[PDB]
Every structure is written in structure tokens, then in C-alpha cells.
Design an enzyme around this catalytic site. Structure first.
Site, PDB file in Angstrom:
ATOM      1  N   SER A 141       5.906  -4.668   0.781  1.00  0.00           N
ATOM      2  CA  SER A 141       6.187  -5.854   1.580  1.00  0.00           C
ATOM      3  C   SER A 141       6.076  -7.120   0.734  1.00  0.00           C
ATOM      4  CB  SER A 141       5.239  -5.931   2.770  1.00  0.00           C
ATOM      5  OG  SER A 141       5.382  -7.168   3.446  1.00  0.00           O
ATOM      6  N   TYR A 154      -2.865  -4.112   6.624  1.00  0.00           N
ATOM      7  CA  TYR A 154      -1.486  -3.756   6.307  1.00  0.00           C
ATOM      8  C   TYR A 154      -1.082  -4.328   4.948  1.00  0.00           C
ATOM      9  CZ  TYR A 154       3.661  -4.005   6.558  1.00  0.00           C
ATOM     10  OH  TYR A 154       5.005  -3.924   6.283  1.00  0.00           O
TER      11      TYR A 154
HETATM   12  N1  LIG Z   1       7.801  -8.179   6.388  1.00  0.00           N
HETATM   13  C1  LIG Z   1       7.374  -6.838   5.976  1.00  0.00           C
HETATM   14  O1  LIG Z   1       6.273  -6.686   5.480  1.00  0.00           O
HETATM   15  C2  LIG Z   1       8.310  -5.603   6.180  1.00  0.00           C
HETATM   16  C3  LIG Z   1       9.416  -5.712   6.989  1.00  0.00           C
HETATM   17  C4  LIG Z   1      10.237  -4.631   7.177  1.00  0.00           C
HETATM   18  C5  LIG Z   1       9.953  -3.426   6.552  1.00  0.00           C
HETATM   19  N2  LIG Z   1       8.844  -3.314   5.743  1.00  0.00           N
HETATM   20  C6  LIG Z   1       8.563  -2.052   5.096  1.00  0.00           C
HETATM   21  O2  LIG Z   1       9.792  -1.047   5.370  1.00  0.00           O
HETATM   22  C7  LIG Z   1       9.286   0.129   5.680  1.00  0.00           C
HETATM   23  C8  LIG Z   1      10.107   0.786   6.796  1.00  0.00           C
HETATM   24  O3  LIG Z   1       9.834   0.158   8.007  1.00  0.00           O
HETATM   25  P1  LIG Z   1      10.998   0.151   9.122  1.00  0.00           P
HETATM   26  O4  LIG Z   1      11.735  -1.186   9.071  1.00  0.00           O
HETATM   27  O5  LIG Z   1      11.976   1.280   8.830  1.00  0.00           O
HETATM   28  O6  LIG Z   1      10.344   0.342  10.569  1.00  0.00           O
HETATM   29  P2  LIG Z   1      10.326   1.717  11.379  1.00  0.00           P
HETATM   30  O7  LIG Z   1       9.081   1.772  12.213  1.00  0.00           O
HETATM   31  O8  LIG Z   1      11.538   1.790  12.260  1.00  0.00           O
HETATM   32  O9  LIG Z   1      10.358   2.964  10.334  1.00  0.00           O
HETATM   33  C9  LIG Z   1       9.217   3.846  10.295  1.00  0.00           C
HETATM   34  C10 LIG Z   1       9.702   5.329  10.031  1.00  0.00           C
HETATM   35  O10 LIG Z   1       8.821   5.966   9.299  1.00  0.00           O
HETATM   36  C11 LIG Z   1       8.296   7.232  10.158  1.00  0.00           C
HETATM   37  N3  LIG Z   1       6.880   7.450   9.913  1.00  0.00           N
HETATM   38  C12 LIG Z   1       5.819   6.669  10.236  1.00  0.00           C
HETATM   39  N4  LIG Z   1       4.697   7.293   9.807  1.00  0.00           N
HETATM   40  C13 LIG Z   1       5.058   8.456   9.219  1.00  0.00           C
HETATM   41  C14 LIG Z   1       4.319   9.455   8.621  1.00  0.00           C
HETATM   42  N5  LIG Z   1       2.918   9.506   8.471  1.00  0.00           N
HETATM   43  N6  LIG Z   1       4.942  10.535   8.101  1.00  0.00           N
HETATM   44  C15 LIG Z   1       6.294  10.637   8.166  1.00  0.00           C
HETATM   45  N7  LIG Z   1       7.033   9.644   8.760  1.00  0.00           N
HETATM   46  C16 LIG Z   1       6.410   8.559   9.283  1.00  0.00           C
HETATM   47  C17 LIG Z   1       8.485   6.924  11.371  1.00  0.00           C
HETATM   48  O11 LIG Z   1       8.684   8.171  12.213  1.00  0.00           O
HETATM   49  C18 LIG Z   1       9.788   6.059  11.343  1.00  0.00           C
HETATM   50  O12 LIG Z   1      10.894   6.845  11.379  1.00  0.00           O
HETATM   51  C19 LIG Z   1       7.900  -0.138   6.181  1.00  0.00           C
HETATM   52  O13 LIG Z   1       7.069   0.827   5.717  1.00  0.00           O
HETATM   53  C20 LIG Z   1       7.498  -1.520   5.571  1.00  0.00           C
HETATM   54  O14 LIG Z   1       6.532  -1.274   4.497  1.00  0.00           O
HETATM   55  C21 LIG Z   1       8.023  -4.396   5.553  1.00  0.00           C
END
Ligand SMILES: NC(=O)c1ccc[n+]([C@@H]2O[C@H](COP(=O)([O-])OP(=O)(O)OC[C@H]3O[C@@H](n4cnc5c(N)ncnc54)[C@H](O)[C@@H]3O)[C@@H](O)[C@H]2O)c1
Ligand SMILES: NC(=O)c1ccc[n+]([C@@H]2O[C@H](COP(=O)([O-])OP(=O)(O)OC[C@H]3O[C@@H](n4cnc5c(N)ncnc54)[C@H](O)[C@@H]3O)[C@@H](O)[C@H]2O)c1
Lengths: 264, 256
Positions: A141, A154
């Protein structure tokens, strides 16, 4: 419909690939003509995956249900993937969560899962083990770089991800293994992860100034970030750290913190 | 023998205080005349603590055996400490380990324990909760700032500690709570933690005397007196270096 050539012949593993950015990463890699794509996630998305296999008949689409926090599970999961795939050219570790109320889970999923998936992938990627070499993109992030007071736990895991990923970007290791290591750090993003935000923060009185993280999320979508990731993948720059904000990719020149310039 | 006045009337909690730097931190605070000192550690070290209480009869010396990774235990542990102490002016979270072969344990002890101890301490320190306010010094590493390729997992947790601790150093948090938050990052140090190093690293084929625990401890107490919120210190060669931590993300970055 059309399948491209950008990632022709490439085998790719994607944690978190059932939803959000991970799901788009998986689609876009298949659309770019990746020979094989494996998906590691906790949630089952059969209706999406049935369509996905259909749209990519001449490409491998493998789905495994697995908690990335589970060390041995992840190890096992990679063994199975490797026997079918034979090699792993690309790993994008996207899987993560946002929950400050649950500290243990956050650490083990966010930081632990990245580590588990990365270390597990290495034997099947490394030249010294008969692999062709490859690249691991780890998801972090912006708050990993610059702390955000509302979400300390986080944030910590994201700082950990960056520092972890940079370690493995050693010149000696690369010459031996052939594997490269890249960190990407998305900014304001339309993620379902930050839904019900104030139910997932430690200090409840910070709901007054919570606007900072969730005001301009519309700026970029999962698909936008995914496009940025594939852009980064093509760059193939070892040790690089990218910020993804407003649908755009910014490389950081990260200068050393302790150089000895401190006075006393 | 002589007990001082530098930390007169101060109540202090110290995780990891049975060994290494933590043990010295505990001694030096008592020697500086801290009214009360609590120690949280996995090991008992009875012969050292019997001697310690003796040397400080008019000071409280409390010892609790507890895993800092244990969220509820730490919470519980702080309640009892609070009952006796009544308030907590100083927390130095020193407890940690080095084991890259065991990833889960590393994360939960090193990063998790810092978080657990910190969040648990806050109610008993914060002004708004009737507390006097105070300071939390969290232990990190130089590799937390600048990654070290030999020890990636251990490093990650230290980077996590820094970022975590800096968050809480928000001015809005401080005017509400009165608690300050400081990170210290020791360099080459004579620690028993790094004994049998190569048995505790992931990549096996890969190839301080300047400062001791007591030296680092003296540096910590130095830092404590400084009482500068949000500060990050490097401790190398018996000496304390404040860092000017400039933001990583600027608008000068050119989009590729
Ligand atoms: N401003 C920020 O800090 C920011 C913003 C957006 C995304 N992100 C990062 O992008 C990454 C993806 O987030 P996103 O946008 O796709 O949201 P999201 O919640 O839609 O994606 C999460 C996915 O990961 C899966 N998951 C969660 N825990 C799991 C586990 N223990 N084992 C297997 N699968 C698991 C979930 O089933 C889900 O499909 C995040 O991890 C984040 O670090 C950070
Ligand atoms: N270059 C570096 O990275 C560096 C150098 C020196 C010290 N340090 C840090 O200093 C801190 C202390 O290390 P040290 O030099 O005193 O070595 P040490 O091993 O002698 O001290 C560790 C103490 O913490 C206790 N402990 C370990 N796990 C615990 C747990 N789960 N719960 C409660 N107590 C636990 C141990 O009983 C021990 O007393 C560490 O956090 C270390 O990261 C880092």
C-alpha cells in the site's frame, strides 16, 4: 473475446484472484495470452470461473481454495500447481484484508501470506532448480511507505511487505536464481476491502477525519490497477517499487534511510 | 548501590526484561530511581530478580511470565499491573526473537507483541482515561529502515514496527491522550539473539563489539528523557542518532 500475445507462453500464479484486483489480474493475463494461470483464494467464484475457462479454452485456468496464511497449505498448493504447470514465470501476490480489530489475522494474512506464497514459489521459478527464472510482484500500500494514523496495524503489514520484497531483490540471489522481485503500492482505489471502514478501525474517534482514505477512491478501479500491474510486469525491473495512483504508475527512487549523516 | 532521581516517581513496564537489553533497561530505570518497574517475559530469571528487588527495597519490582504474542494474556497482564501501579508513565517494548525458519512465530512475537503491548498499555496511560500521559518506546532494527538480504522475514517485522509506531505519533492522538510514541533502531549489537545465526536463516549458502545491551539501554534512557514524539533513533557504537525521515511519495515522481 480476443486473446493477445503480450504474455504468450507465460505461466502465472495469482493469490487473491477470485475478487477485486486479483480477479482482474487473472482475466487480463489470460486476455494477454498467458499459457497458464493459477488462482489461490479463500472464496469460491464458480460462476465467474466457468465463464473464464469457456473464454480461454486453449489456456490453463486452475483454481485452488486455500488460506495464504496456511504455510503448509500454500506449500502443498504450489506442489500441485507445479506438476501441471511445470514452471512458474509470474507470481502476483494480491490476497489481503483490512481488519484492525483483528490484529493476529491481519499480520498472518497480509504479511504472512505474501511471505508464504513468495518463499513457496521460489523452487519452481529458480534457474538452479531447472526453472526458467521469473518475477514476483508483491502487493502493498501507499500507507506502507507513508504511515496513515487511522490504520496502524494494516499499515505495519504493508511496510513489512515492502521491506521483505526488497530484501529478495539481491544481485547475488538474482544471478543464482534468475528471479526478480517487485513491490507495487496502490493509492486511492475502489476496493470493496474498505467497505464498512469505521467498523474496522481501532480508534473510533477518528471517524471525524476518515475522509482522507475514502474521499477519492473513484480515481482508479481494480481493472485500472491491474493494467498498471501488467505494465509493471513487462518492465521487469528488479527491486523496483511502484506507486499506482489515478490509473498511473510511478516508480520510486528509494534512498537509504541510515547513511550516517545523522549528527549526534 | 546508589539510587538516582532521573526517573523519580515514574512507573514503567518493560517487555523482554528478563534478558539482554530489556534486562538492562529494567536495571537502569530502577537505578535511576523509578518508583515502579514491571517486567514481562517468557523466562523467569529468579536469581537476577531476587538480587534486583533486594537492591531496590523502596521500589516496586513486578515480574510476570507472559507471551507478548498472546493478545488476551497481555491485556490481562496489564490490568493487574495497572491495579498495583495505578498508572503507567513508560513502556519499553523490547521483547523479540530471531528465527527466519519459523515465519509465523516471528511475525506474532516481533510485530504482534509490540502491537499487543502498545494497544494494551494505552488506557492506563491516556489522559482522557484519567491517566497522566506518558511515552512508549518500541524496539526495532536498522534493517527495519534499510532491508538486509540475509534476514528478510525478521526485517519485515521491524519495518512493520517502525511504521506502526509512527502512526500513533499523530498530533490529534497526542492532544487527546497525552501519550508519545518513539522508535529506536539498534545497529551492530552484542546480542545473544544472533547466536547460531546461520541455523536461523532461509538461504543457507549466503555469507559488533562496539556496543552492548547496557550501552543500548543507556541510549534508550537518553531517548526517554528527550521525550520527542514521533522520533526515530538509530543506536550504533554506544551512540544515539536521530533520523530525519523524509516522505517516500512525492509529486516529483514521473509516471512511466
Ligand atoms: N489504499 C490502499 O492501501 C490499497 C487500496 C487498494 C488495494 N490495496 C491492496 O490490494 C490488495 C487487493 O485488495 P482488493 O482491492 O483486491 O480488495 P478485495 O477485498 O476485493 O480482494 C481481496 C481478495 O483476496 C481474498 N483473500 C483474502 N484473504 C485471503 C486469504 N487468507 N487467503 C486467500 N485469499 C484471501 C479474498 O477472498 C479476495 O478475493 C490488498 O491486499 C491491498 O494490500 C491497498
Ligand atoms: N541489528 C538488529 O536487528 C538488532 C540488534 C540488537 C537488538 N535488536 C532488537 O532488541 C530487542 C531485544 O533483543 P536482545 O538484544 O535483548 O536479545 P535477547 O534474546 O537477549 O532478548 C530477548 C528477550 O525477550 C524475551 N522474549 C522473547 N520472546 C518473548 C515473548 N514471546 N514474550 C515475552 N518475552 C519474550 C526473551 O525471554 C528475552 O529475554 C529485540 O527486539 C531485537 O530485535 C535488534
Amino acid at each position: 473475446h480476443h486473446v493477445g500475445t503480450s504474455f504468450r507462453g507465460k505461466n502465472a500464479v495469482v493469490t487473491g484472484g477470485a475478487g477485486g484486483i486479483g480477479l482482474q489480474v487473472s482475466k487480463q493475463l489470460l486476455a494477454a495470452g498467458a499459457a497458464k494461470v493459477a488462482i489461490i483464494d479463500l472464496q469460491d467464484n464458480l460462476e465467474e470461473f466457468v465463464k473464464l475457462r469457456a473464454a480461454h479454452p486453449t489456456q490453463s485456468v486452475m483454481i485452488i481454495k486455500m488460506d495464504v496464511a496456511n504455510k503448509k497449505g500454500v506449500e502443498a498448493t504450489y506442489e500441485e500447481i507445479a506438476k501441471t504447470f511445470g514452471n512458474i514465470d509470474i507470481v502476483v501476490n494480491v490476497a489481503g484484508i483490512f481488519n484492525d480489530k483483528d490484529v493476529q489475522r491481519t499480520l498472518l494474512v497480509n504479511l504472512g501470506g505474501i511471505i508464504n506464497s513468495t518463499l513457496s514459489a521460489l523452487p519452481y521459478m529458480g534457474k538452479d532448480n531447472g526453472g526458467k527464472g521469473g518475477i514476483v510482484v508483491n502487493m502493498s500500500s501507499v500507507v506502507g511507505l507513508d504511515p496513515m494514523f487511522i490504520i496502524p496495524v494494516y499499515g505495519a503489514t504493508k511496510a513489512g511487505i515492502i521491506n521483505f520484497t526488497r530484501c529478495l531483490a539481491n544481485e547475488k540471489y538474482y544471478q543464482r536464481s534468475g528471479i526478480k522481485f517487485v513491490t507495487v503500492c496502490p493509492g486511492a482505489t475502489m476496493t470493496d476491502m474498505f467497505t464498512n471502514f469505521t467498523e474496522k478501525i481501532i480508534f473510533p474517534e477518528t471517524s471525524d477525519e476518515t475522509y482522507r482514505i475514502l474521499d477519492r477512491l473513484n480515481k482508479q478501479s481494480a481493472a485500472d490497477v491491474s493494467r498498471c500491474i501488467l505494465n509493471v510486469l513487462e518492465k521487469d525491473k528488479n527491486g523496483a517499487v511502484y506507486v499506482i495512483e489515478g490509473k498511473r504508475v510511478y516508480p520510486l527512487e528509494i534512498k537509504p534511510q541510515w547513511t550516517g549523516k545523522e549528527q549526534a
